[PDB]
From a paper:
Type 1 enzymes hydrolyze all types of RNA/DNA hybrids but require at least four ribonucleotides embedded in a dsDNA sequence to cleave (Ohtani et al., 1999), while most type 2 enzymes can hydrolyze all types of hybrids including DNA-RNA1-DNA/DNA (Eder and Walder, 1991; Eder et al., 1993; Jeong et al., 2004; Ohtani et al., 1999, 2008). Tm-RNase H2 contains two domains—the N-terminal catalytic core adopts the RNase H fold.
The third structure reported here is that of wild-type ΔC protein in complex with a single ribonucleotide substrate in the presence of Ca2+ to inhibit cleavage, solved at 2.1 Å resolution (structure WT-1R-Ca). The complex structure of wild-type protein solved in the presence of Ca2+ ions, which inhibit cleavage (structure WT-1R-Ca), contains three metal ions bound at the active site—two of them very similar in position to those observed in RNase H1 and other RISF enzymes. The geometry of metal ion B coordination is quite irregular, as also observed in RNase H1 (Nowotny et al., 2005, 2007; Nowotny and Yang, 2006). It involves side chains of D18, E19, and D107 as well as two oxygens of the scissile phosphate—the 3′ leaving group and nonbridging pro-Sp. The coordination of metal ion A is octahedral and quite regular, and the coordination distances are between 2.4 and 2.6 Å—longer than ideal distances for coordination of Mg2+ or Ca2+. Metal ion A is coordinated by the side chain of D18, backbone carbonyl of E19, pro-Sp nonbridging oxygen of the scissile phosphate, and pro-Rp nonbridging oxygen of the phosphate group at position +2. The coordination of metal ion A by the phosphate group at position +2 is possible because of the deformation of the nucleic acid backbone introduced by the interaction with tyrosine 163. It also coordinates Ca2+ ion B in wild-type Tm-RNase H2 structure.
Numbering used by the authors: 2 to 223
DNA sequence: GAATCAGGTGTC
């Protein structure tokens, strides 16, 4: 009832959610969704099965206005994952062709460029948020698969860059990449300033990012 | 789908 209630009062309402807070590699992805038609079975995203999420997606993209926003591994390393997530969400809102007057954002502590409110477990209280969580996850899983193709030695298509045993194995065996979040503890502990300087000289990371991670390596660790 | 192992970080 959330959505409809908020629509009476505010007009165009979008639901916003992100995917990729907790992984070790790749961008964080956010989606903003405005939806008027009914879509049955929207219940969350991490609550669903991959087969299902693909089914609801096809219907969500038929019936809903969607905006997708991304913040890169560099932005995560420089701004932290909270601020990177906020940025991806604000970018999702900009990418929505329909301009929302109010937003419902999954989680808490988040104020976007559009006035709205935060719902803990929003993904299971709101259909709009539930839809956004599906779009976010699916779209990001698509990007991650694309990386596996770019980095054949890494099973990105399976673990989606999260800290699974297999992913950690691949990092030790194959080495840290620029798409890893170099500020994240497990990646940071396998890094050397040697490889970091190599990334920089090859131009694979920015100076600002080089500088930040070099400082973190030094602080590693008391 | 739900339990229950694993393992990332931010707000307060
Ligand atoms: Ca989510
Ligand atoms: Ca969320
Ligand atoms: Ca949740
Ligand atoms: Ca610093
Ligand atoms: Ca395991």
């Amino acid at each position: 009832g959330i959505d409809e209630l908020y629509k009476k009062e505010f007009g165009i309402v979008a639901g916003v959610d992100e995917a990729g807070r907790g992984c070790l590699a790749g961008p964080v992805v956010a989606a903003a969704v405005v939806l008027e038609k009914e879509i049955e079975g929207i219940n969350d995203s991490k609550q669903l099965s991959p087969a299902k999420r693909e089914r609801l997606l096809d219907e969500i993209m038929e019936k809903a206005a969607v905006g997708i926003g991304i913040a890169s591994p560099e932005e995560i390393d420089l701004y932290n994952i909270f601020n990177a997530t906020k940025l991806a969400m604000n970018r999702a809102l900009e990418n929505l062709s329909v301009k929302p007057s109010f937003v419902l954002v999954d989680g808490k502590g988040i104020e976007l460029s559009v006035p709205g409110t935060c719902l803990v477990k929003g993904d299971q209280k709101s259909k709009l948020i539930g839809a956004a969580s599906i779009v976010a996850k699916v779209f990001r899983d698509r990007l991650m698969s694309e990386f596996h193709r770019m980095y054949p030695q890494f099973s990105f298509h399976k673990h989606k860059g999260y800290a699974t045993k297999e992913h950690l194995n691949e990092i030790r065996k194959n080495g840290v990449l620029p798409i890893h979040r170099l500020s994240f503890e497990p990646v940071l502990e396998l890094l050397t300033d040697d490889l970091l300087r190599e990334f920089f000289e090859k131009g694979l990371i920015s100076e600002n990012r080089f500088e930040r991670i070099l400082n973190l390596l030094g602080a590693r660790k008391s």
